[PDB]
Amino acid sequence: DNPNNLGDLPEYLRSVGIRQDEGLSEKDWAGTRVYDRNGNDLTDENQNLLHAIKFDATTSFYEFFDKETGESTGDEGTFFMTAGITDVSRLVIISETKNYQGVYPLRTLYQDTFTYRQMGKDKNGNDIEVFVENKATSGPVYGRPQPYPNNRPRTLEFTNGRRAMTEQTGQIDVNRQGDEIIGKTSFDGTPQLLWNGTKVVDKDGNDVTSANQNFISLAKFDQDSSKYEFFNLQTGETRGDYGYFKVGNQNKFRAHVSIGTNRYGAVLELTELNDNRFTYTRMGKDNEGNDIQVYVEHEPYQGTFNPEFTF
């Protein structure tokens, strides 16, 4: 029925963010106005913040398009709304073609309006926080009641969409959200799990951890806030690599944006995901220093550290 709802959970048990992602996926969007926090109109000074958008929750995929033509801008990638259960809601954009990431606190998502906070420009070219208002260009009118409503059809179409992800090294659980599998919280929102990288292997299962040590962390995920942080496995100290994460696309990738000492985004294909192990794949090294595909295995952490998030 709803392929994004792994485990067929009633809505009341789901994160706010995944429900918001689904809401965003129902409509074509276009940037219409930009305002400062007081409500003063700065649309003319921030035209570059305004585009047309299509979102797909199931694949956690977005693309931007020209408002005039609907032609792609060539910017596509991963998006998600943060979980929003124990922390505030933010839109995360990880561009897979334009090599940037953005984190935009939610201001409004209701009916035909989607507004978030972004850095923009005031009348004098000074950098200021602005609110970027998007309006739906498809769907209902949202006026008076209609027994027989005349809804605007959708028109945007993705150029490519999310690629098919088929790399597998072990069982991949598809009956619970991957955020729950790696970032389980208790009823009151307290994260319950810690993981560590155990080894890095090549496609034949040979251990190449020696050549890929910096991929090994003590990792902490929280499904209720979408927060992650990576710590030095041996010292328990933060690596300065922390921000927001999402397991998406029928649990076939883990994506994250680092907002710490090195600004980057990652979209990593998951090849195993279960309560005993998760594995992602990316390019790494062999011991001769050649560039090879590697697989970074993780298991539940058995050590004594229990680090708090540093942000």
PDB file of C-alpha atoms in Angstrom:
ATOM      1  CA  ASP A   1       0.000   0.000   0.000  1.00  0.00           C
ATOM      2  CA  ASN A   2       2.393   2.806   1.210  1.00  0.00           C
ATOM      3  CA  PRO A   3       5.858   1.474   0.342  1.00  0.00           C
ATOM      4  CA  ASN A   4       7.566   4.116   2.471  1.00  0.00           C
ATOM      5  CA  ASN A   5       5.808   2.875   5.576  1.00  0.00           C
ATOM      6  CA  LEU A   6       7.988  -0.089   6.387  1.00  0.00           C
ATOM      7  CA  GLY A   7       6.161  -2.139   8.946  1.00  0.00           C
ATOM      8  CA  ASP A   8       2.775  -0.575   8.126  1.00  0.00           C
ATOM      9  CA  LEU A   9       2.756   1.584  11.211  1.00  0.00           C
ATOM     10  CA  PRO A  10      -0.329   3.647  12.168  1.00  0.00           C
ATOM     11  CA  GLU A  11       0.474   7.306  11.663  1.00  0.00           C
ATOM     12  CA  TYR A  12       0.586   8.039  15.426  1.00  0.00           C
ATOM     13  CA  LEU A  13       3.641   5.796  15.772  1.00  0.00           C
ATOM     14  CA  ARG A  14       5.600   7.397  12.948  1.00  0.00           C
ATOM     15  CA  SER A  15       8.080  10.265  13.118  1.00  0.00           C
ATOM     16  CA  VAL A  16       6.730  13.747  12.299  1.00  0.00           C
ATOM     17  CA  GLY A  17       9.388  14.082   9.588  1.00  0.00           C
ATOM     18  CA  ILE A  18       8.515  11.001   7.578  1.00  0.00           C
ATOM     19  CA  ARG A  19       4.869  12.092   7.510  1.00  0.00           C
ATOM     20  CA  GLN A  20       6.005  15.530   6.410  1.00  0.00           C
ATOM     21  CA  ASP A  21       8.141  13.984   3.661  1.00  0.00           C
ATOM     22  CA  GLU A  22       4.990  12.183   2.442  1.00  0.00           C
ATOM     23  CA  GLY A  23       2.990  15.432   2.592  1.00  0.00           C
ATOM     24  CA  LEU A  24       5.678  17.166   0.521  1.00  0.00           C
ATOM     25  CA  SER A  25       5.515  14.363  -2.015  1.00  0.00           C
ATOM     26  CA  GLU A  26       1.842  14.984  -2.804  1.00  0.00           C
ATOM     27  CA  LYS A  27       2.313  18.307  -4.561  1.00  0.00           C
ATOM     28  CA  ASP A  28       4.473  20.194  -6.973  1.00  0.00           C
ATOM     29  CA  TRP A  29       6.025  23.239  -5.220  1.00  0.00           C
ATOM     30  CA  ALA A  30       7.280  26.576  -6.360  1.00  0.00           C
ATOM     31  CA  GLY A  31       9.072  29.336  -4.453  1.00  0.00           C
ATOM     32  CA  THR A  32       6.855  32.420  -4.437  1.00  0.00           C
ATOM     33  CA  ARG A  33       7.978  34.886  -1.723  1.00  0.00           C
ATOM     34  CA  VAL A  34      10.895  35.633   0.579  1.00  0.00           C
ATOM     35  CA  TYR A  35      10.464  37.540   3.911  1.00  0.00           C
ATOM     36  CA  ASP A  36      12.575  38.603   6.852  1.00  0.00           C
ATOM     37  CA  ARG A  37      11.539  37.450  10.369  1.00  0.00           C
ATOM     38  CA  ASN A  38       9.326  40.510  10.898  1.00  0.00           C
ATOM     39  CA  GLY A  39       7.462  39.787   7.647  1.00  0.00           C
ATOM     40  CA  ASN A  40       8.987  42.386   5.347  1.00  0.00           C
ATOM     41  CA  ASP A  41       8.970  41.336   1.692  1.00  0.00           C
ATOM     42  CA  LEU A  42      12.469  40.617   0.269  1.00  0.00           C
ATOM     43  CA  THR A  43      11.383  38.575  -2.746  1.00  0.00           C
ATOM     44  CA  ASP A  44      13.062  40.855  -5.351  1.00  0.00           C
ATOM     45  CA  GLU A  45      16.395  40.601  -3.503  1.00  0.00           C
ATOM     46  CA  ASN A  46      16.297  36.759  -3.226  1.00  0.00           C
ATOM     47  CA  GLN A  47      15.009  35.466  -6.570  1.00  0.00           C
ATOM     48  CA  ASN A  48      17.792  32.921  -6.536  1.00  0.00           C
ATOM     49  CA  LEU A  49      16.154  31.130  -3.596  1.00  0.00           C
ATOM     50  CA  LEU A  50      12.982  30.425  -5.604  1.00  0.00           C
ATOM     51  CA  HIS A  51      12.574  27.292  -7.706  1.00  0.00           C
ATOM     52  CA  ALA A  52      10.084  24.584  -8.494  1.00  0.00           C
ATOM     53  CA  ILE A  53      10.497  21.358  -6.479  1.00  0.00           C
ATOM     54  CA  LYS A  54       9.429  17.739  -6.688  1.00  0.00           C
ATOM     55  CA  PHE A  55       9.935  15.495  -3.682  1.00  0.00           C
ATOM     56  CA  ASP A  56       9.537  11.713  -3.420  1.00  0.00           C
ATOM     57  CA  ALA A  57       9.372  10.379   0.117  1.00  0.00           C
ATOM     58  CA  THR A  58       9.731   6.683  -0.760  1.00  0.00           C
ATOM     59  CA  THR A  59      13.121   7.265  -2.426  1.00  0.00           C
ATOM     60  CA  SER A  60      14.015  10.380  -0.346  1.00  0.00           C
ATOM     61  CA  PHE A  61      14.712  12.087  -3.649  1.00  0.00           C
ATOM     62  CA  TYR A  62      14.274  15.690  -4.794  1.00  0.00           C
ATOM     63  CA  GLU A  63      14.904  17.711  -7.914  1.00  0.00           C
ATOM     64  CA  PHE A  64      14.715  21.443  -8.602  1.00  0.00           C
ATOM     65  CA  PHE A  65      13.242  22.891 -11.762  1.00  0.00           C
ATOM     66  CA  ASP A  66      12.870  26.246 -13.421  1.00  0.00           C
ATOM     67  CA  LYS A  67       9.644  27.973 -12.395  1.00  0.00           C
ATOM     68  CA  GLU A  68       9.040  29.334 -15.962  1.00  0.00           C
ATOM     69  CA  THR A  69       9.543  26.105 -17.959  1.00  0.00           C
ATOM     70  CA  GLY A  70       9.628  23.195 -15.578  1.00  0.00           C
ATOM     71  CA  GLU A  71      13.043  22.300 -17.085  1.00  0.00           C
ATOM     72  CA  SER A  72      15.425  20.710 -14.605  1.00  0.00           C
ATOM     73  CA  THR A  73      18.058  22.958 -12.993  1.00  0.00           C
ATOM     74  CA  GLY A  74      20.237  19.831 -12.845  1.00  0.00           C
ATOM     75  CA  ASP A  75      20.174  19.898  -9.013  1.00  0.00           C
ATOM     76  CA  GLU A  76      18.891  16.589  -7.671  1.00  0.00           C
ATOM     77  CA  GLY A  77      19.637  14.485  -4.658  1.00  0.00           C
ATOM     78  CA  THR A  78      18.517  13.374  -1.245  1.00  0.00           C
ATOM     79  CA  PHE A  79      16.143  15.202   1.067  1.00  0.00           C
ATOM     80  CA  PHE A  80      14.490  14.515   4.348  1.00  0.00           C
ATOM     81  CA  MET A  81      12.667  16.286   7.102  1.00  0.00           C
ATOM     82  CA  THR A  82      14.281  15.501  10.453  1.00  0.00           C
ATOM     83  CA  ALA A  83      12.276  13.309  12.732  1.00  0.00           C
ATOM     84  CA  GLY A  84      10.837  16.106  14.830  1.00  0.00           C
ATOM     85  CA  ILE A  85       9.812  13.996  17.831  1.00  0.00           C
ATOM     86  CA  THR A  86      12.384  15.187  20.395  1.00  0.00           C
ATOM     87  CA  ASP A  87      13.861  18.061  18.429  1.00  0.00           C
ATOM     88  CA  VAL A  88      12.790  20.782  16.014  1.00  0.00           C
ATOM     89  CA  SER A  89      11.954  20.054  12.406  1.00  0.00           C
ATOM     90  CA  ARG A  90      14.521  20.864   9.674  1.00  0.00           C
ATOM     91  CA  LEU A  91      14.675  20.166   5.963  1.00  0.00           C
ATOM     92  CA  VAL A  92      17.943  18.517   4.916  1.00  0.00           C
ATOM     93  CA  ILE A  93      19.082  18.737   1.312  1.00  0.00           C
ATOM     94  CA  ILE A  94      22.118  16.703   0.155  1.00  0.00           C
ATOM     95  CA  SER A  95      22.709  17.472  -3.471  1.00  0.00           C
ATOM     96  CA  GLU A  96      24.022  14.540  -5.465  1.00  0.00           C
ATOM     97  CA  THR A  97      24.825  16.606  -8.568  1.00  0.00           C
ATOM     98  CA  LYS A  98      25.736  20.048  -7.228  1.00  0.00           C
ATOM     99  CA  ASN A  99      28.005  19.046  -4.363  1.00  0.00           C
ATOM    100  CA  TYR A 100      26.480  20.956  -1.412  1.00  0.00           C
ATOM    101  CA  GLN A 101      24.260  20.363   1.589  1.00  0.00           C
ATOM    102  CA  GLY A 102      21.692  22.557   3.228  1.00  0.00           C
ATOM    103  CA  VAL A 103      19.818  22.527   6.506  1.00  0.00           C
ATOM    104  CA  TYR A 104      16.674  24.706   6.557  1.00  0.00           C
ATOM    105  CA  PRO A 105      14.604  24.965   9.743  1.00  0.00           C
ATOM    106  CA  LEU A 106      10.894  24.424   9.059  1.00  0.00           C
ATOM    107  CA  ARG A 107       8.585  27.401   9.496  1.00  0.00           C
ATOM    108  CA  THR A 108       5.325  26.159   7.918  1.00  0.00           C
ATOM    109  CA  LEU A 109       3.959  23.053   6.296  1.00  0.00           C
ATOM    110  CA  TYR A 110       0.195  23.228   5.857  1.00  0.00           C
ATOM    111  CA  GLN A 111      -2.037  22.617   2.883  1.00  0.00           C
ATOM    112  CA  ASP A 112      -0.482  24.506  -0.087  1.00  0.00           C
ATOM    113  CA  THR A 113       2.301  26.232   1.878  1.00  0.00           C
ATOM    114  CA  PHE A 114       5.830  25.077   2.665  1.00  0.00           C
ATOM    115  CA  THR A 115       8.118  27.643   4.244  1.00  0.00           C
ATOM    116  CA  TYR A 116      11.631  27.204   5.661  1.00  0.00           C
ATOM    117  CA  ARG A 117      14.441  29.421   6.930  1.00  0.00           C
ATOM    118  CA  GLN A 118      17.540  30.106   4.753  1.00  0.00           C
ATOM    119  CA  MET A 119      20.325  32.642   4.530  1.00  0.00           C
ATOM    120  CA  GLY A 120      19.425  35.386   2.120  1.00  0.00           C
ATOM    121  CA  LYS A 121      20.004  39.084   1.443  1.00  0.00           C
ATOM    122  CA  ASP A 122      18.317  42.212   2.766  1.00  0.00           C
ATOM    123  CA  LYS A 123      17.934  45.517   0.833  1.00  0.00           C
ATOM    124  CA  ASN A 124      21.638  46.400   1.356  1.00  0.00           C
ATOM    125  CA  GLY A 125      23.247  43.093   0.389  1.00  0.00           C
ATOM    126  CA  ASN A 126      23.743  42.144   4.051  1.00  0.00           C
ATOM    127  CA  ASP A 127      23.451  38.441   4.937  1.00  0.00           C
ATOM    128  CA  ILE A 128      20.270  37.812   6.979  1.00  0.00           C
ATOM    129  CA  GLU A 129      17.988  34.959   7.856  1.00  0.00           C
ATOM    130  CA  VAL A 130      14.974  34.863   5.587  1.00  0.00           C
ATOM    131  CA  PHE A 131      11.878  32.708   5.214  1.00  0.00           C
ATOM    132  CA  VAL A 132      11.383  31.182   1.797  1.00  0.00           C
ATOM    133  CA  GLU A 133       7.720  30.546   1.064  1.00  0.00           C
ATOM    134  CA  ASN A 134       6.861  27.827  -1.449  1.00  0.00           C
ATOM    135  CA  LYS A 135       3.311  27.378  -2.745  1.00  0.00           C
ATOM    136  CA  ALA A 136       1.828  24.290  -4.279  1.00  0.00           C
ATOM    137  CA  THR A 137       1.271  24.529  -8.015  1.00  0.00           C
ATOM    138  CA  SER A 138      -0.771  21.311  -8.092  1.00  0.00           C
ATOM    139  CA  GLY A 139      -3.552  19.865  -5.965  1.00  0.00           C
ATOM    140  CA  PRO A 140      -6.596  21.467  -4.389  1.00  0.00           C
ATOM    141  CA  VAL A 141      -7.552  25.132  -4.302  1.00  0.00           C
ATOM    142  CA  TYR A 142      -8.154  24.983  -0.504  1.00  0.00           C
ATOM    143  CA  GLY A 143     -11.094  27.348  -0.537  1.00  0.00           C
ATOM    144  CA  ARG A 144     -14.755  26.675   0.168  1.00  0.00           C
ATOM    145  CA  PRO A 145     -16.148  23.151   0.335  1.00  0.00           C
ATOM    146  CA  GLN A 146     -16.620  21.237  -2.912  1.00  0.00           C
ATOM    147  CA  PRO A 147     -18.475  17.963  -3.330  1.00  0.00           C
ATOM    148  CA  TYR A 148     -16.783  17.679  -6.775  1.00  0.00           C
ATOM    149  CA  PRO A 149     -13.420  19.491  -6.527  1.00  0.00           C
ATOM    150  CA  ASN A 150     -11.451  20.616  -9.539  1.00  0.00           C
ATOM    151  CA  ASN A 151      -7.881  19.836  -8.478  1.00  0.00           C
ATOM    152  CA  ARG A 152      -4.828  21.046 -10.432  1.00  0.00           C
ATOM    153  CA  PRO A 153      -2.944  18.202 -12.045  1.00  0.00           C
ATOM    154  CA  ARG A 154       0.718  17.543 -11.346  1.00  0.00           C
ATOM    155  CA  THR A 155       3.224  18.367 -14.065  1.00  0.00           C
ATOM    156  CA  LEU A 156       6.764  18.104 -12.756  1.00  0.00           C
ATOM    157  CA  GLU A 157       8.624  14.839 -13.575  1.00  0.00           C
ATOM    158  CA  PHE A 158      12.046  13.743 -12.401  1.00  0.00           C
ATOM    159  CA  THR A 159      14.769  13.551 -15.054  1.00  0.00           C
ATOM    160  CA  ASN A 160      16.199  10.340 -13.609  1.00  0.00           C
ATOM    161  CA  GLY A 161      15.055   9.734 -10.051  1.00  0.00           C
ATOM    162  CA  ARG A 162      16.904   7.546  -7.582  1.00  0.00           C
ATOM    163  CA  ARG A 163      19.053   4.826  -9.123  1.00  0.00           C
ATOM    164  CA  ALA A 164      18.288   1.178  -8.502  1.00  0.00           C
ATOM    165  CA  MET A 165      20.298  -0.017  -5.459  1.00  0.00           C
ATOM    166  CA  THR A 166      21.025  -3.735  -5.536  1.00  0.00           C
ATOM    167  CA  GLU A 167      24.350  -4.253  -3.674  1.00  0.00           C
ATOM    168  CA  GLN A 168      23.882  -6.809  -0.903  1.00  0.00           C
ATOM    169  CA  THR A 169      26.254  -8.542   1.527  1.00  0.00           C
ATOM    170  CA  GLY A 170      23.754  -9.768   4.123  1.00  0.00           C
ATOM    171  CA  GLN A 171      20.122  -9.537   5.206  1.00  0.00           C
ATOM    172  CA  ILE A 172      18.431  -6.157   4.804  1.00  0.00           C
ATOM    173  CA  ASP A 173      15.432  -5.685   7.144  1.00  0.00           C
ATOM    174  CA  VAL A 174      12.484  -4.021   5.335  1.00  0.00           C
ATOM    175  CA  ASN A 175       9.807  -4.401   8.070  1.00  0.00           C
ATOM    176  CA  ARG A 176      11.051  -1.599  10.325  1.00  0.00           C
ATOM    177  CA  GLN A 177      12.404   1.871   9.431  1.00  0.00           C
ATOM    178  CA  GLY A 178      16.184   1.811   9.254  1.00  0.00           C
ATOM    179  CA  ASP A 179      16.291   4.795  11.594  1.00  0.00           C
ATOM    180  CA  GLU A 180      14.681   2.595  14.260  1.00  0.00           C
ATOM    181  CA  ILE A 181      17.097  -0.282  13.545  1.00  0.00           C
ATOM    182  CA  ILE A 182      20.223   1.882  14.022  1.00  0.00           C
ATOM    183  CA  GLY A 183      18.780   4.689  16.171  1.00  0.00           C
ATOM    184  CA  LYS A 184      16.159   3.080  18.436  1.00  0.00           C
ATOM    185  CA  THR A 185      14.867   5.207  21.289  1.00  0.00           C
ATOM    186  CA  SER A 186      12.880   4.305  24.372  1.00  0.00           C
ATOM    187  CA  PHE A 187       9.301   5.562  24.914  1.00  0.00           C
ATOM    188  CA  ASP A 188      10.653   8.846  26.401  1.00  0.00           C
ATOM    189  CA  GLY A 189      13.014   9.480  23.490  1.00  0.00           C
ATOM    190  CA  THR A 190      16.326   8.304  24.975  1.00  0.00           C
ATOM    191  CA  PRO A 191      18.639   6.728  22.369  1.00  0.00           C
ATOM    192  CA  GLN A 192      19.264   3.078  23.271  1.00  0.00           C
ATOM    193  CA  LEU A 193      21.929   1.908  20.787  1.00  0.00           C
ATOM    194  CA  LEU A 194      25.582   2.385  19.966  1.00  0.00           C
ATOM    195  CA  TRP A 195      27.489   0.828  17.088  1.00  0.00           C
ATOM    196  CA  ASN A 196      31.093   0.488  16.118  1.00  0.00           C
ATOM    197  CA  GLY A 197      32.776  -0.200  12.837  1.00  0.00           C
ATOM    198  CA  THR A 198      34.227  -3.676  13.142  1.00  0.00           C
ATOM    199  CA  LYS A 199      36.068  -4.205   9.856  1.00  0.00           C
ATOM    200  CA  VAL A 200      36.285  -2.934   6.292  1.00  0.00           C
ATOM    201  CA  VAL A 201      36.294  -5.638   3.636  1.00  0.00           C
ATOM    202  CA  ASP A 202      36.655  -5.769  -0.127  1.00  0.00           C
ATOM    203  CA  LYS A 203      34.161  -7.386  -2.486  1.00  0.00           C
ATOM    204  CA  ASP A 204      35.642 -10.822  -1.789  1.00  0.00           C
ATOM    205  CA  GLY A 205      35.454 -10.433   1.965  1.00  0.00           C
ATOM    206  CA  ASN A 206      39.173  -9.858   2.444  1.00  0.00           C
ATOM    207  CA  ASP A 207      39.944  -7.611   5.385  1.00  0.00           C
ATOM    208  CA  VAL A 208      41.282  -4.236   4.276  1.00  0.00           C
ATOM    209  CA  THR A 209      40.627  -2.386   7.550  1.00  0.00           C
ATOM    210  CA  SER A 210      44.289  -1.472   7.831  1.00  0.00           C
ATOM    211  CA  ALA A 211      43.979   0.703   4.741  1.00  0.00           C
ATOM    212  CA  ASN A 212      40.626   2.241   5.693  1.00  0.00           C
ATOM    213  CA  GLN A 213      40.966   2.871   9.465  1.00  0.00           C
ATOM    214  CA  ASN A 214      39.437   6.326   9.305  1.00  0.00           C
ATOM    215  CA  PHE A 215      36.114   4.799   8.297  1.00  0.00           C
ATOM    216  CA  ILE A 216      35.879   3.175  11.761  1.00  0.00           C
ATOM    217  CA  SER A 217      33.856   5.048  14.398  1.00  0.00           C
ATOM    218  CA  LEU A 218      31.831   4.585  17.551  1.00  0.00           C
ATOM    219  CA  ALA A 219      28.527   5.819  16.134  1.00  0.00           C
ATOM    220  CA  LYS A 220      25.402   7.066  17.891  1.00  0.00           C
ATOM    221  CA  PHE A 221      22.059   7.544  16.065  1.00  0.00           C
ATOM    222  CA  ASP A 222      18.743   8.893  17.445  1.00  0.00           C
ATOM    223  CA  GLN A 223      15.576   8.108  15.499  1.00  0.00           C
ATOM    224  CA  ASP A 224      13.558  10.741  17.344  1.00  0.00           C
ATOM    225  CA  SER A 225      15.742  13.758  16.451  1.00  0.00           C
ATOM    226  CA  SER A 226      17.593  12.379  13.339  1.00  0.00           C
ATOM    227  CA  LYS A 227      20.843  13.290  15.123  1.00  0.00           C
ATOM    228  CA  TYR A 228      24.033  11.284  14.621  1.00  0.00           C
ATOM    229  CA  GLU A 229      27.554  11.649  15.880  1.00  0.00           C
ATOM    230  CA  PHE A 230      30.762   9.770  15.280  1.00  0.00           C
ATOM    231  CA  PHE A 231      33.286   9.309  18.098  1.00  0.00           C
ATOM    232  CA  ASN A 232      36.863   7.954  18.187  1.00  0.00           C
ATOM    233  CA  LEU A 233      36.335   4.256  18.941  1.00  0.00           C
ATOM    234  CA  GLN A 234      39.381   4.010  21.160  1.00  0.00           C
ATOM    235  CA  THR A 235      39.049   7.267  23.174  1.00  0.00           C
ATOM    236  CA  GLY A 236      35.283   7.910  23.076  1.00  0.00           C
ATOM    237  CA  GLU A 237      35.915  11.538  22.097  1.00  0.00           C
ATOM    238  CA  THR A 238      33.937  13.199  19.300  1.00  0.00           C
ATOM    239  CA  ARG A 239      35.449  13.167  15.839  1.00  0.00           C
ATOM    240  CA  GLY A 240      33.695  16.481  15.199  1.00  0.00           C
ATOM    241  CA  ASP A 241      31.520  14.670  12.617  1.00  0.00           C
ATOM    242  CA  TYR A 242      27.905  15.114  13.673  1.00  0.00           C
ATOM    243  CA  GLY A 243      24.584  16.340  12.199  1.00  0.00           C
ATOM    244  CA  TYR A 244      21.520  14.698  10.768  1.00  0.00           C
ATOM    245  CA  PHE A 245      20.977  11.271   9.189  1.00  0.00           C
ATOM    246  CA  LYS A 246      18.309   9.284   7.336  1.00  0.00           C
ATOM    247  CA  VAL A 247      17.991   5.661   6.299  1.00  0.00           C
ATOM    248  CA  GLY A 248      15.810   5.718   3.187  1.00  0.00           C
ATOM    249  CA  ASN A 249      14.742   4.110  -0.049  1.00  0.00           C
ATOM    250  CA  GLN A 250      13.341   0.881   1.433  1.00  0.00           C
ATOM    251  CA  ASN A 251      16.343   0.879   3.791  1.00  0.00           C
ATOM    252  CA  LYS A 252      18.845   0.854   0.920  1.00  0.00           C
ATOM    253  CA  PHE A 253      20.893   3.910   1.857  1.00  0.00           C
ATOM    254  CA  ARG A 254      22.108   5.822   4.845  1.00  0.00           C
ATOM    255  CA  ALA A 255      22.514   9.556   4.203  1.00  0.00           C
ATOM    256  CA  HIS A 256      23.942  12.179   6.449  1.00  0.00           C
ATOM    257  CA  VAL A 257      24.952  15.802   6.611  1.00  0.00           C
ATOM    258  CA  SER A 258      27.865  16.821   8.820  1.00  0.00           C
ATOM    259  CA  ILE A 259      27.491  20.262  10.374  1.00  0.00           C
ATOM    260  CA  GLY A 260      30.779  20.069  12.358  1.00  0.00           C
ATOM    261  CA  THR A 261      34.541  20.482  11.682  1.00  0.00           C
ATOM    262  CA  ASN A 262      34.269  19.241   8.080  1.00  0.00           C
ATOM    263  CA  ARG A 263      31.139  20.167   6.047  1.00  0.00           C
ATOM    264  CA  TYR A 264      30.086  17.307   3.813  1.00  0.00           C
ATOM    265  CA  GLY A 265      27.208  15.070   2.901  1.00  0.00           C
ATOM    266  CA  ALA A 266      27.143  11.345   2.271  1.00  0.00           C
ATOM    267  CA  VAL A 267      24.649   9.005   0.593  1.00  0.00           C
ATOM    268  CA  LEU A 268      25.905   5.486   1.226  1.00  0.00           C
ATOM    269  CA  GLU A 269      24.295   2.327  -0.047  1.00  0.00           C
ATOM    270  CA  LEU A 270      23.419  -0.163   2.686  1.00  0.00           C
ATOM    271  CA  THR A 271      24.349  -3.773   1.887  1.00  0.00           C
ATOM    272  CA  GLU A 272      23.306  -5.342   5.211  1.00  0.00           C
ATOM    273  CA  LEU A 273      20.941  -3.928   7.855  1.00  0.00           C
ATOM    274  CA  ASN A 274      19.631  -5.779  10.885  1.00  0.00           C
ATOM    275  CA  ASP A 275      19.829  -5.681  14.698  1.00  0.00           C
ATOM    276  CA  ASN A 276      23.200  -7.462  14.662  1.00  0.00           C
ATOM    277  CA  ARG A 277      24.968  -5.669  11.825  1.00  0.00           C
ATOM    278  CA  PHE A 278      24.822  -2.875   9.358  1.00  0.00           C
ATOM    279  CA  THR A 279      27.136  -2.480   6.411  1.00  0.00           C
ATOM    280  CA  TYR A 280      27.521   0.313   3.871  1.00  0.00           C
ATOM    281  CA  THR A 281      29.601   0.433   0.732  1.00  0.00           C
ATOM    282  CA  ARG A 282      31.769   3.169  -0.803  1.00  0.00           C
ATOM    283  CA  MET A 283      35.131   3.587  -2.472  1.00  0.00           C
ATOM    284  CA  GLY A 284      38.151   2.891  -0.270  1.00  0.00           C
ATOM    285  CA  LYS A 285      41.639   1.497  -0.363  1.00  0.00           C
ATOM    286  CA  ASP A 286      43.492  -1.770  -0.431  1.00  0.00           C
ATOM    287  CA  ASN A 287      46.909  -2.144   1.289  1.00  0.00           C
ATOM    288  CA  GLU A 288      48.778  -1.358  -1.862  1.00  0.00           C
ATOM    289  CA  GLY A 289      46.887   1.988  -1.958  1.00  0.00           C
ATOM    290  CA  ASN A 290      44.693   1.113  -4.944  1.00  0.00           C
ATOM    291  CA  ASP A 291      41.175   2.484  -5.081  1.00  0.00           C
ATOM    292  CA  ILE A 292      38.658  -0.377  -4.598  1.00  0.00           C
ATOM    293  CA  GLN A 293      35.085  -0.790  -3.535  1.00  0.00           C
ATOM    294  CA  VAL A 294      34.867  -1.471   0.211  1.00  0.00           C
ATOM    295  CA  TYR A 295      32.229  -2.515   2.707  1.00  0.00           C
ATOM    296  CA  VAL A 296      32.289  -1.040   6.211  1.00  0.00           C
ATOM    297  CA  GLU A 297      30.731  -3.436   8.730  1.00  0.00           C
ATOM    298  CA  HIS A 298      29.225  -2.317  12.071  1.00  0.00           C
ATOM    299  CA  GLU A 299      28.009  -4.260  15.090  1.00  0.00           C
ATOM    300  CA  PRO A 300      26.430  -3.271  18.417  1.00  0.00           C
ATOM    301  CA  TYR A 301      29.060  -1.697  20.619  1.00  0.00           C
ATOM    302  CA  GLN A 302      30.243  -3.863  23.501  1.00  0.00           C
ATOM    303  CA  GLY A 303      32.664  -1.357  25.076  1.00  0.00           C
ATOM    304  CA  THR A 304      32.310   0.870  28.129  1.00  0.00           C
ATOM    305  CA  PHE A 305      31.930   4.327  26.535  1.00  0.00           C
ATOM    306  CA  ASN A 306      28.476   5.874  26.548  1.00  0.00           C
ATOM    307  CA  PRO A 307      28.993   9.242  24.958  1.00  0.00           C
ATOM    308  CA  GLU A 308      26.464  12.069  24.907  1.00  0.00           C
ATOM    309  CA  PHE A 309      25.820  14.072  21.762  1.00  0.00           C
ATOM    310  CA  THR A 310      28.057  17.155  21.778  1.00  0.00           C
ATOM    311  CA  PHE A 311      25.471  19.302  19.981  1.00  0.00           C
TER     312      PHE A 311
END
